Amino acid sequence: ENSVHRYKKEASNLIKLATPVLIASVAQTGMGFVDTIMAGGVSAIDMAAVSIAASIWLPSILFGVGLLMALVPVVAQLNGAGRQHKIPFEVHQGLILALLVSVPIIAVLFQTQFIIRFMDVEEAMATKTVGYMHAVIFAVPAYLLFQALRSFTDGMSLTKPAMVIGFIGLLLNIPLNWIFVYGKFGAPELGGVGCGVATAIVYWIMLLLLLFYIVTSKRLAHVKVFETFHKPQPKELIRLFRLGFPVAAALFFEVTLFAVVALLVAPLGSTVVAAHQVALNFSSLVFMFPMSIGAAVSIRVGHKLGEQDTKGAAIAANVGLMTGLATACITALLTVLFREQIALLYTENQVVVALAMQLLLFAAIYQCMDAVQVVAAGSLRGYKDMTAIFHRTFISYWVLGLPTGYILGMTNWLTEQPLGAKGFWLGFIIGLSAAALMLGQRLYWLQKQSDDVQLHLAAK
Ligand SMILES: [Rb+]
Secondary structure, rough: OOOOOHHHHHHHHHHHHHHHHHHHHHHHHHHHHHHHHHHHHOOOHHHHHHHHHHHHHHHHHHHHHHHHHHHHHHHOOOOOOOOOHHHHHHHHHHHHHHHHHHHHHHHHHHHHHOOOOOOOOOOOHHHHHHHHHHHHHHHHHHHHHHHHHHHHOOOOHHHOOOOOOOOHHHHHHHHHHHHHHOOOOOOOHHHHHHHHHHHHHHHHHHHHHHHHHHHOOOOOOOOOOOOOOOOOOOOHHHHHHHHHHHHHHHHHHHHHHHHHHHHHHHOOOOOHHHHHHHHHHHHHHHHHHHHHHHHHHHHHHHHHHHOOOOOOOHHHHHHHHHHHHHHHHHOOOOOOOHHHHHHHOOOOOOOOOOHHHHHHHHHHHHHHHHHHHHHHHHHHHHHHHHHHHHHHHHHHHHHHHHHHHHHHHHHHHHHOOOHHHHHHHHHHHHHHHHHHHHHHHOOOOOOOOHHHHOOOOOOO
16 A cells, blocks of 8 residues: 555546646747747847737736636635535636636736836837737636636546647637738737737637536536626635635745846846846746646645545645656756757857856756745645645745845855855745745644644635
């Protein structure tokens, strides 16, 4: 029984979600730069590049409040095989809040879009172009919710819709852009106006997968149909909040903090690229990896949580964990080689490859400890309120990390080190391996007794 049944089902479960979830990222990122940079990038005169950049930036924060409307969707809990129903209303409910948020964000949207801060050039251009192409990315989150139930939750959990709008999504974007970003066959557009239009068509397709793969459930029924408002479930939404609030600010409010530091500590040279290029890019993607595992094990841990209420921990926990280290490990320890050519990455010259190669190094290891931090956290703890204190945990490694890490760049500015820039980039890792330690002492919390339905007695 020891490890036998563990790695067995552990392995399985993870992958069924693994491959799914992974490909999905290829959507986000894949589609992301694809139709985005491709056209509105080397076309609106690179004024497509930097312009559309700040564009979806603002959105970045937004999509943030969006994950709040996603841990709700981990609520794929009430199907521990138990209430394989009651979820339909639980869901419909979420979806509502979906809109009840996108709008609270449209505000921020329209207005600042008209305000920017300066008048560079992205103004007019990106500004309102993607501007109403953003009204588009409000109807997107609605779909996002669908994904909640299906996509990830997938009724019980059959994360397949990934590759659905996945391979299908990115595909579409491409030509939709072509003809629109300029193409012309009813109207020829511009870069920002482009990536943007491509976007309208996105939540379009998304809806497609929405209704479709969901109310069609080629395999199941036990679905939706009649729904309604709510004030107390919307108080449970205040729980969808007091669960989603701990994630929204976390990952994204933090997203701003992330931004903060680096920049602040980005005047440390032309390295900007080194740092920027290296770290950011490559990493971001390897990060994309362990995060994949998370929501898998996060949901996977959340379904096995609800059956006989067995040992999903050692499983989902000790499993998911054990493996991301591989991926982190494997990706990290494979990363090592790829420096030089990876370095290339952003098509240029020697431009940092050396220190880049060095900075490159920093990432491999981050990916490592980062991985560990992700998983446990957002996943196991991602189950519920842990999300509340996984959040606390979040900033614990933050303030400690960064200031410690910048003051590491700055320790050069203090004690002493071979390169304050690279090195400060590093202090950041300290943060992630630091917080990564933090959720470990969240070691289930005394593990689970019957304080499990207690988490769902404050979550139910
Ligand atoms: Rb990061």
